[PDB]
Each structure stands twice: as structure tokens, then as C-alpha cells.
Short mmCIF file of N, CA and C and ligand atoms in Angstrom, two decimals:
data_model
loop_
_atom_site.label_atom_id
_atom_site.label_comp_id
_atom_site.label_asym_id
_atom_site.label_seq_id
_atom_site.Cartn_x
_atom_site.Cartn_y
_atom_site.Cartn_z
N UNK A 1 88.93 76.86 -29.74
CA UNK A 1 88.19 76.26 -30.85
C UNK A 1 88.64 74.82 -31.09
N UNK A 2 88.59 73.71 -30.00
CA UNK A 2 89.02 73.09 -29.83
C UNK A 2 90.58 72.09 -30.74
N UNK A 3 91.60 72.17 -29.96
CA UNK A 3 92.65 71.95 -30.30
C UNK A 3 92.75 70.71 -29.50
N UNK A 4 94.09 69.78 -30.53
CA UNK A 4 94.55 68.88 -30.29
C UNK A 4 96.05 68.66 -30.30
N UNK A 5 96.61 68.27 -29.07
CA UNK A 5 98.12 68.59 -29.10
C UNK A 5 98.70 66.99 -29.36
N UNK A 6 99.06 66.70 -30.65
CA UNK A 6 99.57 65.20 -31.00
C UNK A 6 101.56 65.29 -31.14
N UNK A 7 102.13 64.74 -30.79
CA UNK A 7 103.71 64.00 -30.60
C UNK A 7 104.26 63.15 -31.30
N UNK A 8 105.13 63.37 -32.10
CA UNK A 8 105.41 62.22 -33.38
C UNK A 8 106.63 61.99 -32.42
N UNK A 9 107.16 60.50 -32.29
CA UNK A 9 108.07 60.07 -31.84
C UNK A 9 108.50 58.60 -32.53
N UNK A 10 110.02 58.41 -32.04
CA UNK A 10 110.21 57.43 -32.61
C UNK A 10 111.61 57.51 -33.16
N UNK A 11 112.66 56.20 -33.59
CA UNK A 11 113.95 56.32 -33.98
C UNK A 11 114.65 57.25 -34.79
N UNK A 12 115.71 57.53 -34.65
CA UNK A 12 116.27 58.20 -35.83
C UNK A 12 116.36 58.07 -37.23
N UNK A 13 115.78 58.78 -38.10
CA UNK A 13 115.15 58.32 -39.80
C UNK A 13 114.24 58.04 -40.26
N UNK A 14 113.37 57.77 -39.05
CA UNK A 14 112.39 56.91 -39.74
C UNK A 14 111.12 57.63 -40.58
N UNK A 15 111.00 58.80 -40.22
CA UNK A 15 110.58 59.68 -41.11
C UNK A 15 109.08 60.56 -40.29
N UNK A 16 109.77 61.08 -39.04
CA UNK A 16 108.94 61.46 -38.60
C UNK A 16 108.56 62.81 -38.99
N UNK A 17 109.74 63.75 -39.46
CA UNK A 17 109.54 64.82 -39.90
C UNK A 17 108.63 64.80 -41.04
N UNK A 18 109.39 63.73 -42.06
CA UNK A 18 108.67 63.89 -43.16
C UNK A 18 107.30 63.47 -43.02
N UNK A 19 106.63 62.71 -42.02
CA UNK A 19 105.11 62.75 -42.05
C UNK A 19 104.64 63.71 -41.94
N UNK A 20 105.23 64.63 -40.76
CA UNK A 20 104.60 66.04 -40.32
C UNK A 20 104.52 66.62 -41.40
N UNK A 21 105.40 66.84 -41.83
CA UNK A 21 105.09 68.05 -43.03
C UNK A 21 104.66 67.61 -44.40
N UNK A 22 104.57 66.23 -44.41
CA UNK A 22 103.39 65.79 -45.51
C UNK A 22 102.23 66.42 -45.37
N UNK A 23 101.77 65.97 -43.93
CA UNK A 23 100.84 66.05 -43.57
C UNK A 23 100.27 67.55 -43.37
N UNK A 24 101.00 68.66 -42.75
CA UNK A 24 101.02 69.96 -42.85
C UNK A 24 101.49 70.65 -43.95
N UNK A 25 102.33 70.63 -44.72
CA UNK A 25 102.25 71.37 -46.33
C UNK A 25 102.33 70.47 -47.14
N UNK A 26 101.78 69.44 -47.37
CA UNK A 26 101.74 68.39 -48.59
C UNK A 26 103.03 68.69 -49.71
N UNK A 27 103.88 67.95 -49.05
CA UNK A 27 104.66 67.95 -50.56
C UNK A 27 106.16 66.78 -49.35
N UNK A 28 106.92 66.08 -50.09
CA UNK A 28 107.39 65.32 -49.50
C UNK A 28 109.06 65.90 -49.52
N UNK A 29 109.40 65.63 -47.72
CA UNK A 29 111.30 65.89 -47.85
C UNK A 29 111.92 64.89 -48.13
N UNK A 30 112.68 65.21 -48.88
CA UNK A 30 113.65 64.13 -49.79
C UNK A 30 115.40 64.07 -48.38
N UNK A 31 115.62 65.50 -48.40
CA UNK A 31 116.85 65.29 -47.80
C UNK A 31 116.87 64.85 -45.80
N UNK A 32 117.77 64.67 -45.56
CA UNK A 32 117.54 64.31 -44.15
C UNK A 32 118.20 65.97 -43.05
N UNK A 33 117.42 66.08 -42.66
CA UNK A 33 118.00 67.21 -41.66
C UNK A 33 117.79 66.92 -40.24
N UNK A 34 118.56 65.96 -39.10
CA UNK A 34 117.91 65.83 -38.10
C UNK A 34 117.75 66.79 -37.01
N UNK A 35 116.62 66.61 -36.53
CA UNK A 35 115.34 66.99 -35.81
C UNK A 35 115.91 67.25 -34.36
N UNK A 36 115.69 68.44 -33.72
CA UNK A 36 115.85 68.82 -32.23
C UNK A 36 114.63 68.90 -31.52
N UNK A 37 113.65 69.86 -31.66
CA UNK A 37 112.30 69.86 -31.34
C UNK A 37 111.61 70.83 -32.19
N UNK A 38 110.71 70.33 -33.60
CA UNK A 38 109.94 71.47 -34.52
C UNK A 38 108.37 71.45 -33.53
N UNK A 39 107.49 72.38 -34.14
CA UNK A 39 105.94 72.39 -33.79
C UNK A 39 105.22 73.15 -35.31
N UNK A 40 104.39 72.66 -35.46
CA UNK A 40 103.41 72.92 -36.18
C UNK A 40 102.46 72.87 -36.33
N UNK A 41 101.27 73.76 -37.04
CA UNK A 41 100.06 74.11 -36.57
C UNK A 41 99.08 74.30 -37.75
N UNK A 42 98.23 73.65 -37.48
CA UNK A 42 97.13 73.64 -38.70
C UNK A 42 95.79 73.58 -38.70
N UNK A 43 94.90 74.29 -38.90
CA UNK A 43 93.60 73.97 -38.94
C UNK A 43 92.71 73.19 -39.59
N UNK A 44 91.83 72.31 -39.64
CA UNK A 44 91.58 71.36 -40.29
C UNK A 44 90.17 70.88 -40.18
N UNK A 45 89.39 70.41 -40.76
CA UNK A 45 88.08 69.95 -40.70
C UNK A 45 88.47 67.97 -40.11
N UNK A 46 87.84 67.77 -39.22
CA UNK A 46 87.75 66.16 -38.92
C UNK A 46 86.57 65.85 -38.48
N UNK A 47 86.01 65.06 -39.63
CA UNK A 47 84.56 64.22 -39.19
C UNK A 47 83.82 65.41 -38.52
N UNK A 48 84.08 66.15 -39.43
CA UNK A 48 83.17 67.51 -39.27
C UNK A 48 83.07 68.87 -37.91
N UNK A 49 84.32 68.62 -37.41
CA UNK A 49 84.32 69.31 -36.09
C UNK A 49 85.80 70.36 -37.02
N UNK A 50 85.70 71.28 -36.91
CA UNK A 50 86.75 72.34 -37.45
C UNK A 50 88.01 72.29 -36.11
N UNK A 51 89.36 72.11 -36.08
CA UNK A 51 89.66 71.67 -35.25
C UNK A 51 91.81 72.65 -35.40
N UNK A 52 92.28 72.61 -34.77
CA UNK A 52 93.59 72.86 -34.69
C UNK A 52 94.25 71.98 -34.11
N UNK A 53 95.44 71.64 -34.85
CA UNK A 53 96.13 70.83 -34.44
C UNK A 53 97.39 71.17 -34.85
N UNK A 54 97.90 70.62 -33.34
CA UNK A 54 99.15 71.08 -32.77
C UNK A 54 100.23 69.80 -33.04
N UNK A 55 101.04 70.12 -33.34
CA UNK A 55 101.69 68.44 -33.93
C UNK A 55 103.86 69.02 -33.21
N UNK A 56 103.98 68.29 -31.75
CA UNK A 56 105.85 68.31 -32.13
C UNK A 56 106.00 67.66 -32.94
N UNK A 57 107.23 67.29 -33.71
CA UNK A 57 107.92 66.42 -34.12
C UNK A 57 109.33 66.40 -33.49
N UNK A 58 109.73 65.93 -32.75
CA UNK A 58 110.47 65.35 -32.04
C UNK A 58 112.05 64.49 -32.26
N UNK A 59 113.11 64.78 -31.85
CA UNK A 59 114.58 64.04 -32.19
C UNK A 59 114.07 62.45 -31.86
N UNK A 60 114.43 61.87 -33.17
CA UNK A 60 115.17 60.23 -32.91
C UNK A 60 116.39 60.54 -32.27
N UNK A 61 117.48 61.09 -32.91
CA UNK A 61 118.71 60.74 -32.35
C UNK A 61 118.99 60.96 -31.01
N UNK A 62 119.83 60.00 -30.61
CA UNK A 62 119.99 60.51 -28.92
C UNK A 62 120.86 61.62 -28.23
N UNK A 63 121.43 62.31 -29.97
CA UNK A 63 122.75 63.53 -29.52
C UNK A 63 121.56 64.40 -29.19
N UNK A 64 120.15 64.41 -30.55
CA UNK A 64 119.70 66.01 -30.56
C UNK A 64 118.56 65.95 -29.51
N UNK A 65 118.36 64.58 -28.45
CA UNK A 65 117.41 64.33 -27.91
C UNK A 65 117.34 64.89 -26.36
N UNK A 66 118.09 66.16 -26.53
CA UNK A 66 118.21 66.85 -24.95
C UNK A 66 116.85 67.59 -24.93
N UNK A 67 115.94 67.41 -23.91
CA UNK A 67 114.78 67.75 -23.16
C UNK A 67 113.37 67.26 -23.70
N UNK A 68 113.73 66.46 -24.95
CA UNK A 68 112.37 65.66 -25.41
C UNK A 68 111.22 65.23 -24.21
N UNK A 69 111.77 64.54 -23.19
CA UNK A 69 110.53 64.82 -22.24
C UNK A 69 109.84 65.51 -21.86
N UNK A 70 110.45 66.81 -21.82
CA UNK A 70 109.34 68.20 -21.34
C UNK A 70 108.59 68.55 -22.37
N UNK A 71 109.06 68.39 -23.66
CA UNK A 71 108.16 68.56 -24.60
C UNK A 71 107.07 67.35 -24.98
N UNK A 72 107.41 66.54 -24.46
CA UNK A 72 106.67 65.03 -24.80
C UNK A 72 105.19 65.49 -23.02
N UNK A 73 105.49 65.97 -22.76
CA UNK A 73 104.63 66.15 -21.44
C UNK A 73 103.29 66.53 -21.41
N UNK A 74 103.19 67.61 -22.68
CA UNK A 74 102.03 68.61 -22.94
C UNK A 74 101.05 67.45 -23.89
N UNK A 75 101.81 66.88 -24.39
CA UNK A 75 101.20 65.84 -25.66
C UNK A 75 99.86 65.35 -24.93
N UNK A 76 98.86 65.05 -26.02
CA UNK A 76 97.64 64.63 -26.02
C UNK A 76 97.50 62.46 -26.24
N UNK A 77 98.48 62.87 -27.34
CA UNK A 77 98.28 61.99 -27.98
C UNK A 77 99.93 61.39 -28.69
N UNK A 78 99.56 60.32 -28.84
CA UNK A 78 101.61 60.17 -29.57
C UNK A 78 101.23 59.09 -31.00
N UNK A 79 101.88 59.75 -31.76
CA UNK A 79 102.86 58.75 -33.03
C UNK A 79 103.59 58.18 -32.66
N UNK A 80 103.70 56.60 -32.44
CA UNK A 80 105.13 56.52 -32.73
C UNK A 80 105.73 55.38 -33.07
N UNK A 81 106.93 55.70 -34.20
CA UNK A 81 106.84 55.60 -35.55
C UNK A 81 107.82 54.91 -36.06
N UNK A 82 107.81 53.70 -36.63
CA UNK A 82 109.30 53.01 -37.04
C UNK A 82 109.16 52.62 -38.53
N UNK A 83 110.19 52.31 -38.93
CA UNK A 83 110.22 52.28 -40.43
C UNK A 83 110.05 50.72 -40.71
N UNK A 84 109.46 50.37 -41.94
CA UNK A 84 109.13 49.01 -42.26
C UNK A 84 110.25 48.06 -42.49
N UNK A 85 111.16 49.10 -43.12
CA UNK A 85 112.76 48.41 -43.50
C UNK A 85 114.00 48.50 -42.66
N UNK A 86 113.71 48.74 -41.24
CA UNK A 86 114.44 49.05 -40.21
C UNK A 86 113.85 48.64 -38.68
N UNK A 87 114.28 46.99 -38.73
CA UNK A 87 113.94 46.45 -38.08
C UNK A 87 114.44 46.73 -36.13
N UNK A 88 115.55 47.27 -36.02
CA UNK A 88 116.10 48.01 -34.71
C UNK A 88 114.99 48.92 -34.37
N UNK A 89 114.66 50.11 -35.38
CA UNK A 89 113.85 50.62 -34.99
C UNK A 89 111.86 50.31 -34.51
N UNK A 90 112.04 49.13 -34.84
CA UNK A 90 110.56 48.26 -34.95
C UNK A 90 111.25 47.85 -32.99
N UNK A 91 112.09 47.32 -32.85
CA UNK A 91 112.42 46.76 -31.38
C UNK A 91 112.26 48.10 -30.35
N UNK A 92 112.65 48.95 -30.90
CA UNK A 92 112.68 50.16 -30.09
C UNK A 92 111.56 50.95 -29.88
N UNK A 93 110.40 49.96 -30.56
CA UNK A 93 109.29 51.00 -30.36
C UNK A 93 108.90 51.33 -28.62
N UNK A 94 109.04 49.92 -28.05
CA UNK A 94 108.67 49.83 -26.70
C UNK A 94 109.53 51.22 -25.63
N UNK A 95 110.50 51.62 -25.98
CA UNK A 95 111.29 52.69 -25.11
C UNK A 95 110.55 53.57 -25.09
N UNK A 96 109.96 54.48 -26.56
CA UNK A 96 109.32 55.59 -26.87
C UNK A 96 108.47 55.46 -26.19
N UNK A 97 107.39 54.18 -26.28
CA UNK A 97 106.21 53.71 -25.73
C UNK A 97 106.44 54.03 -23.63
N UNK A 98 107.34 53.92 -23.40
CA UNK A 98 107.74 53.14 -21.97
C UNK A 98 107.97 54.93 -21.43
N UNK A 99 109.10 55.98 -22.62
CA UNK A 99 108.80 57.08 -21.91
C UNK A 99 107.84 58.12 -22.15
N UNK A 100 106.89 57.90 -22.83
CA UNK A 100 105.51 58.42 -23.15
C UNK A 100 104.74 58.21 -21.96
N UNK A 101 104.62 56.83 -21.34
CA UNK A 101 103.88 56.56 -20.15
C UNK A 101 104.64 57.01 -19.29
N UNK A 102 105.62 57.61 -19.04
CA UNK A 102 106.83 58.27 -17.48
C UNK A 102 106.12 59.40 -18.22
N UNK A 103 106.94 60.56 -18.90
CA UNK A 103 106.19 61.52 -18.94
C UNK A 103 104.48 62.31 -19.13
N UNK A 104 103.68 60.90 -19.19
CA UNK A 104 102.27 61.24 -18.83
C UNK A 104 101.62 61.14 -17.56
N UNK A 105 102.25 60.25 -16.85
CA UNK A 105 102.65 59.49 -15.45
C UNK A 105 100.88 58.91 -15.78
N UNK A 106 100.90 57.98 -16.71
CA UNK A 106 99.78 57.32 -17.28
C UNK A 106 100.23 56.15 -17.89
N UNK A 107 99.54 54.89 -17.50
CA UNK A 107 100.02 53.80 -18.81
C UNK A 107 98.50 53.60 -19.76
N UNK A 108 97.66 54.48 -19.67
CA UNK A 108 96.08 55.16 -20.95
C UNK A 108 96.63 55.94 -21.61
N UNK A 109 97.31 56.31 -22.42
CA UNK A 109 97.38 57.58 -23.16
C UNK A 109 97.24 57.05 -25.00
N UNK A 110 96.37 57.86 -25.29
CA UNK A 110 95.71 57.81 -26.89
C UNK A 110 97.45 57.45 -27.67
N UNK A 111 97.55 56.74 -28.71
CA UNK A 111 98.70 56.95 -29.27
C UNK A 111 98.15 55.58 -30.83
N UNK A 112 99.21 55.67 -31.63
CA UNK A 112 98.75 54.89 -32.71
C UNK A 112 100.49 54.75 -33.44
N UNK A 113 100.52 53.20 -33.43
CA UNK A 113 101.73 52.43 -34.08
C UNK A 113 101.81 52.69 -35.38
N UNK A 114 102.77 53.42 -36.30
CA UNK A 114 102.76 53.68 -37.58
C UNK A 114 103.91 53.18 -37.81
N UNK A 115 103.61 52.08 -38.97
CA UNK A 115 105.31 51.66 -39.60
C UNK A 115 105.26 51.95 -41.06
N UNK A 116 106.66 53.12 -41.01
CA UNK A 116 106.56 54.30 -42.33
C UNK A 116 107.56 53.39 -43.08
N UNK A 117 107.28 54.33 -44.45
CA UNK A 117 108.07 53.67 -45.83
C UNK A 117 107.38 52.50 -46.12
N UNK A 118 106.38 52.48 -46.03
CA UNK A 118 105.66 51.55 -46.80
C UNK A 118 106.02 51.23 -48.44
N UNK A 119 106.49 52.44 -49.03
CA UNK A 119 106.45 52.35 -50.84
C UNK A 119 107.96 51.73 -50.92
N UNK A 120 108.69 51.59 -50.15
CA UNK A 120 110.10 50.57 -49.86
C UNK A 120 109.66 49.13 -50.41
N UNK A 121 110.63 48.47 -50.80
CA UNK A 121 110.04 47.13 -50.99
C UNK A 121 111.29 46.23 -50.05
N UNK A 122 112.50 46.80 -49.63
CA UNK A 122 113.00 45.77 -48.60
C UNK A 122 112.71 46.38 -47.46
N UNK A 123 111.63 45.26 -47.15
CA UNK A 123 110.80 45.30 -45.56
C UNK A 123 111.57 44.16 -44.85
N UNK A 124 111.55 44.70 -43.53
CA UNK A 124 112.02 43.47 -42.91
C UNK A 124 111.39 43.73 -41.39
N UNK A 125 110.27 44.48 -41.58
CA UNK A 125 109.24 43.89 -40.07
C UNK A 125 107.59 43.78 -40.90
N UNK A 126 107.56 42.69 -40.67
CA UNK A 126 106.07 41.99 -41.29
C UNK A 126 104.98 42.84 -40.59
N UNK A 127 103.47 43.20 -41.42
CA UNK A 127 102.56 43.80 -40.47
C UNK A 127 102.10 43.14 -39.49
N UNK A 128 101.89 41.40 -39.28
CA UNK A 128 101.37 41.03 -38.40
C UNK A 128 102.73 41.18 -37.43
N UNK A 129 103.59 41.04 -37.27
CA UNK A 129 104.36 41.47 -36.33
C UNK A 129 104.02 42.67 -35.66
N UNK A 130 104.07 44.08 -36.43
CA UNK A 130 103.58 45.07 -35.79
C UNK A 130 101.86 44.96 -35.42
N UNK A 131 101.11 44.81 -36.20
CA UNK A 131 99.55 44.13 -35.60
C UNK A 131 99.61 43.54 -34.10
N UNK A 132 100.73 43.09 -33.91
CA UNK A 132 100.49 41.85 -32.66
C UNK A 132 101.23 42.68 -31.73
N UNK A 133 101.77 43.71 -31.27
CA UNK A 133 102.25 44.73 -31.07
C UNK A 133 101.44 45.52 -30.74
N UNK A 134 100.89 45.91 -31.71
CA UNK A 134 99.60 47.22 -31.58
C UNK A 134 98.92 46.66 -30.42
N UNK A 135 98.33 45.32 -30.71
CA UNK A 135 97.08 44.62 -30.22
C UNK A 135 97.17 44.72 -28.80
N UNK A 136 98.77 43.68 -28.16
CA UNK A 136 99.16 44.09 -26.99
C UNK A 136 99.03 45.21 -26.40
N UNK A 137 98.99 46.59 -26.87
CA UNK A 137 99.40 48.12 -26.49
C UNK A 137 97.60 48.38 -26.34
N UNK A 138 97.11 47.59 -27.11
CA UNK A 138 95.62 48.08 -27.35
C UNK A 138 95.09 49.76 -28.09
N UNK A 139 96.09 49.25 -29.05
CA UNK A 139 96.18 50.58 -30.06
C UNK A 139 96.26 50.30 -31.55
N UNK A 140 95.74 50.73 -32.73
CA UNK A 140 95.72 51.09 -33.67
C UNK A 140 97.47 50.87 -34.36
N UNK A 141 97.09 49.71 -35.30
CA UNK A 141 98.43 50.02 -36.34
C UNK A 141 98.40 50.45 -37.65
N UNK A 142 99.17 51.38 -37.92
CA UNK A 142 98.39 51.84 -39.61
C UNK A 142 99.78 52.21 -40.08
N UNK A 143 99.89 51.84 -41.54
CA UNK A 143 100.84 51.88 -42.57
C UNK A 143 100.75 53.08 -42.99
N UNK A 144 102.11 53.41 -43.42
CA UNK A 144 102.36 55.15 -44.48
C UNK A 144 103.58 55.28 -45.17
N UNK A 145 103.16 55.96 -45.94
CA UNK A 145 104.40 56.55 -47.12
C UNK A 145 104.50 57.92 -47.07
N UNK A 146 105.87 58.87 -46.15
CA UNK A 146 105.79 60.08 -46.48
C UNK A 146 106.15 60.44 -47.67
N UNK A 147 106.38 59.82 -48.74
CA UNK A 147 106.98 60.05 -50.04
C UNK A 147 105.59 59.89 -50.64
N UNK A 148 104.78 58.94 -50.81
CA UNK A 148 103.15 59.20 -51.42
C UNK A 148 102.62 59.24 -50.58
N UNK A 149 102.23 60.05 -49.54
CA UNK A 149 101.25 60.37 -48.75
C UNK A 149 100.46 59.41 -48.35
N UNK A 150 100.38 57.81 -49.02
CA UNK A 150 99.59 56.97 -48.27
C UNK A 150 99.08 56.71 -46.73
N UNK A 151 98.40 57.07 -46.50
CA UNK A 151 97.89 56.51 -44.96
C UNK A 151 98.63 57.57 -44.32
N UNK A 152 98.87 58.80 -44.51
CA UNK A 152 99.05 60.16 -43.53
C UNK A 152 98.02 60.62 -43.12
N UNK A 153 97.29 61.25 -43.88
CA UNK A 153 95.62 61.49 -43.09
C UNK A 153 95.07 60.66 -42.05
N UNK A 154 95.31 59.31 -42.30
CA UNK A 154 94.63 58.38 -41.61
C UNK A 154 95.52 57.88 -40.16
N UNK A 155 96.51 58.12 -40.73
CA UNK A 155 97.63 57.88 -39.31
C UNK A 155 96.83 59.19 -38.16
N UNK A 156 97.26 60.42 -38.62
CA UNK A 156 96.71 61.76 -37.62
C UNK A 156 95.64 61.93 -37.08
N UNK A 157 95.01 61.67 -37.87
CA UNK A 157 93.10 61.52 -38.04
C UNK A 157 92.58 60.59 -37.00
N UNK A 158 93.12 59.50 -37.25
CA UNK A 158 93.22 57.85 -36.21
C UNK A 158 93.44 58.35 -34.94
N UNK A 159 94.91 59.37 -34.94
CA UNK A 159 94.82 59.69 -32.93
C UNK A 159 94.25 60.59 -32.72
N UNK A 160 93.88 61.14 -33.74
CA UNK A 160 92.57 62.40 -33.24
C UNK A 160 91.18 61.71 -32.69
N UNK A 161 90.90 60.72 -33.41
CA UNK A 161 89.73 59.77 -32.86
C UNK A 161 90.15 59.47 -31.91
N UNK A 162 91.60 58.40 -31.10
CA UNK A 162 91.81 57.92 -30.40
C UNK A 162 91.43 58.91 -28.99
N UNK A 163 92.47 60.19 -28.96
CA UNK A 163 91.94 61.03 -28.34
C UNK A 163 90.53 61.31 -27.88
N UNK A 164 89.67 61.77 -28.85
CA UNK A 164 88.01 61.42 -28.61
C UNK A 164 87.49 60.57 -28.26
N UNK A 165 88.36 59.26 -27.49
CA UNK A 165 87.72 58.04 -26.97
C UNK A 165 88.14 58.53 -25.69
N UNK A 166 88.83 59.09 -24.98
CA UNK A 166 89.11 59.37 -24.13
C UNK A 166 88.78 60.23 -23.06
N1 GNP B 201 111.05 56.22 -49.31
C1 GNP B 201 110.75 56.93 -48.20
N2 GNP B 201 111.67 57.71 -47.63
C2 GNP B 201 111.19 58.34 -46.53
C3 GNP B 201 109.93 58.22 -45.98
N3 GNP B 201 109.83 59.03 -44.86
C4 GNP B 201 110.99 59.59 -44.72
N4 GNP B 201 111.88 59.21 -45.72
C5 GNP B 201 113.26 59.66 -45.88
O1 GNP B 201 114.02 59.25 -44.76
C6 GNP B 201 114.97 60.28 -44.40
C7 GNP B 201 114.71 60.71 -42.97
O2 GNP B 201 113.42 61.31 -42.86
P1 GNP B 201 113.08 62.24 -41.64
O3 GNP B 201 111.65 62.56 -41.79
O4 GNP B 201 114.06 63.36 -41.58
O5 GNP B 201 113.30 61.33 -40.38
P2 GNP B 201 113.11 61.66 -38.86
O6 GNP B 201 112.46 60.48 -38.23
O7 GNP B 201 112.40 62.94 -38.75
N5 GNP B 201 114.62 61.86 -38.30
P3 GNP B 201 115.11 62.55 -36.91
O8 GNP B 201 114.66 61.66 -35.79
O9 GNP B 201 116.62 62.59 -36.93
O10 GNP B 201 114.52 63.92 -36.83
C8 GNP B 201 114.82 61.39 -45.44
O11 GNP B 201 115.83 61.24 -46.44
C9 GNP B 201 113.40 61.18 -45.96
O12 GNP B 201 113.20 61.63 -47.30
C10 GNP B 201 108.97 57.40 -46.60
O13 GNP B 201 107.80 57.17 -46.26
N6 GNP B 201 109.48 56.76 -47.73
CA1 CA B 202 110.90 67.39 -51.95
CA1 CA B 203 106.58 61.01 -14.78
MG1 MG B 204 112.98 64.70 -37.84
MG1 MG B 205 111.37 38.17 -40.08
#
């Protein structure tokens, strides 16, 4: 009943968990628990096609990051995701990016630049920075807050379209 298998990736903190499960039980994680490999599953209406979606969320850190590629393999589609106020992790987007294309053995694959913590006010990577980024990748950049849900729908939703271009 057609399913979509999407990959949140991206540095340590930056709040990949907490999008997922914004996004899958609406309500926001406050504490930090890092991430080995979760999955979650939800059914959902998009632009009118009733749809399941399959979402990893995936280790930043590089201790809990043993076999992330095999799980990054099945992926459709990728998040991936750096924080607005954590500018290392804005530099590092290109790695995630670099082993997304090894494990798709593709440099096409649907994916969409999200720089989280938007409701932060010390930012220190500008959007046209990430814009000019996206643009290069020829992908979609979109802002979010897993703490107010801003631009979560639209982050998921976005590579679900992306996907459907494909
Ligand atoms: N203010 C704010 N805090 C956020 C946001 N997203 C995540 N956080 C916070 O940042 C911390 C790390 O979030 P988490 O989702 O666990 O990060 P992660 O990218 O999954 N980490 P890991 O790679 O180790 O699994 C948590 O304390 C969480 O509440 C956000 O949009 N705004
Ligand atoms: Ca909470
Ligand atoms: Ca490969
Ligand atoms: Mg996590
Ligand atoms: Mg600057």
C-alpha cells in the first residue's frame, strides 16, 4: 500500500531523533539519549495518496555508529540534518551526503537539507549559506524546530515528493 523508506542522518545532537518522533508521536524530547539504529512506522495521508512510512533514525556519534551503512542502504530517501547553532555540524553535512551516495552506489538519490533548532536564537550558520549548499546538491533546504514542530511535516513530506520525482 505503497510505502516509503526515508533515513534521518546527520551529526551528533542535532536532533534527529527528536524530529522523528515529533513527527511520529507529536510531542517533543527534551532529554538526550544517543541513538544506535531506531525505525519507525506510520501511516499517513500525503497529497492524498494514503501512504506508510518507514523512517531510521540513525547514530550521529561515531562510537554508536557501527553498521549505519547497511542500514543507510535500504533508504529511499535521506534527511540530513544539522543544527542552526552548530556550525561543525553544518561543515559535516558533505560526509553524510558523500556516504549516502557510497551506500546507494548513486550520486541521484532524493534527500532534503534540514537545519534544525530553528526556535534557538544563537545561530551561527546563515540560511543563505545552507540555500547555497542545497542549490549545489540540487536539493531542497527547509528549516525546523523539534521543540515547536515548525517545518516537520514539511521537512518529511518534501522527501516524500522528492522521492515522487524520481
Ligand atoms: N531547542 C531545541 N532543542 C532541540 C531540537 N531538536 C533537538 N533538540 C535537543 O537536542 C538534544 C539532542 O536531540 P536528539 O534528537 O537526541 O539528537 P540526535 O541527532 O538524535 N542525536 P544522536 O545522533 O546522538 O542520536 C536533546 O536534548 C533535544 O531535546 C530543536 O529543534 N530545538
Ligand atoms: Ca518532552
Ligand atoms: Ca557502494
Ligand atoms: Mg538520535
Ligand atoms: Mg558567519
Amino acid at each position: 500500500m505503497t510505502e516509503y523508506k526515508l533515513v534521518v542522518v546527520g551529526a551528533g545532537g542535532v536532533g534527529k531523533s527528536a524530529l522523528t518522533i515529533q513527527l511520529i508521536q507529536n510531542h517533543f524530547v527534551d532529554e538526550y539519549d544517543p541513538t544506535i539504529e531506531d525505525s519507525y512506522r506510520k501511516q499517513v495521508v500525503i497529497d492524498g495518496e494514503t501512504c506508510l512510512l518507514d523512517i531510521l533514525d540513525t547514530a550521529g556519534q561515531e562510537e554508536y555508529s557501527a553498521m549505519r551503512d547497511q542500514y543507510m542502504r535500504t533508504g529511499e530517501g535521506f534527511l540530513c540534518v544539522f543544527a542552526i547553532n552548530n556550525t561543525k555540524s553544518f561543515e559535516d553535512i558533505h560526509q553524510y551526503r558523500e556516504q549516502i551516495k557510497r551506500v546507494k552506489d548513486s550520486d541521484d538519490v532524493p534527500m532534503v537539507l534540514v537545519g534544525n533548532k530553528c526556535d534557538l536564537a544563537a545561530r551561527t550558520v546563515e540560511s543563505r549559506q545552507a540555500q547555497d549548499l542545497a542549490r549545489s546538491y540540487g536539493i531542497p533546504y527547509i528549516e525546523t524546530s523539534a521543540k515547536t514542530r515548525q517545518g516537520v511535516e514539511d521537512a518529511f513530506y518534501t522527501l516524500v515528493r522528492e522521492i515522487r520525482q524520481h
